[PDB]
């Protein structure tokens, strides 16, 4: 599913993301906009280390979800990577919250650092009623 900007913002707010671990909704939005363009079936294969990024947040198979094919990977979210390709994003959000429960927090994603950190992200939630 390819969510519309404001549609993503309310779905994320409803799922308890606004301010989760000090991370604002605009920050989560900027991340999903750059990670997948708000597309839940987005995927990126990393031939360099044979892992795959899944869903709206492009979560990686090496640490967060089990896809059966990543060498010496773990499943810290205790979910099959299939759960991260659903139109319903509850499972992906649960996994993303788990990710930010570690030291780096939202810094976990290099895209966020690249185009969300120290940036004007208000534009992402402007007019969405959140």
From Swiss-Prot:
GO terms for biological process: antimicrobial humoral response; defense response to bacterium; defense response to Gram-negative bacterium; defense response to Gram-positive bacterium; inflammatory response; killing of cells of another organism. It comes from Homo sapiens (Human). This is Lysozyme C. PANTHER family: LYSOZYME C. It catalyses: Hydrolysis of (1->4)-beta-linkages between N-acetylmuramic acid and N-acetyl-D-glucosamine residues in a peptidoglycan and between N-acetyl-D-glucosamine residues in chitodextrins. It is linked to Amyloidosis, hereditary systemic 5: A form of hereditary systemic amyloidosis, a disorder characterized by amyloid deposition in multiple tissues resulting in a wide clinical spectrum. AMYLD5 primarily affects the viscera, and the predominant clinical features are renal dysfunction of varying severity, and intra-abdominal bleeding. Inheritance is autosomal dominant. Disulfide bonds join 6-128, 30-116, 65-81, 77-95. GO terms for molecular function: identical protein binding; lysozyme activity. The active site is at residues 35, 53. GO terms for cellular component: azurophil granule lumen; extracellular exosome; extracellular region; extracellular space; specific granule lumen; tertiary granule lumen. Residues 1-130 form the C-type lysozyme domain. The keyword Hydrolase applies. Monomer. Keywords: Amyloid, Amyloidosis, Antimicrobial, Bacteriolytic enzyme, Disease variant, Disulfide bond, Glycosidase, Hydrolase, Secreted, Signal. Its main location: secreted. Lysozymes have primarily a bacteriolytic function; those in tissues and body fluids are associated with the monocyte-macrophage system and enhance the activity of immunoagents. InterPro entries: Glyco_hydro_22, Glyco_hydro_22_CS, Glyco_hydro_22_lys, Lysozyme-like_dom_sf. Belongs to the glycosyl hydrolase 22 family.
């Amino acid at each position: 599913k390819v969510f519309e900007r404001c549609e993503t913002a309310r779905t994320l707010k409803r799922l308890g993301m606004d301010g989760y671990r000090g991370i604002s909704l605009a920050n989560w939005m900027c991340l999903a906009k750059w990670e997948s363009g708000y597309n839940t079936r987005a995927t990126n294969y990393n031939a360099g280390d044979r892992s795959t990024d899944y869903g709206i947040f492009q979560i990686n198979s090496r640490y967060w979800c089990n896809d059966g094919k990543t060498p010496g990977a773990v499943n810290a979210c205790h979910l099959s990577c299939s759960a991260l390709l659903q139109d319903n994003i509850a499972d992906a959000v649960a996994c993303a919250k788990r990710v930010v429960r570690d030291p780096q927090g939202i810094r976990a994603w290099v895209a966020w650092r690249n185009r969300c950190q120290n940036r004007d992200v208000r534009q992402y939630v402007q007019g969405c009623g959140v």
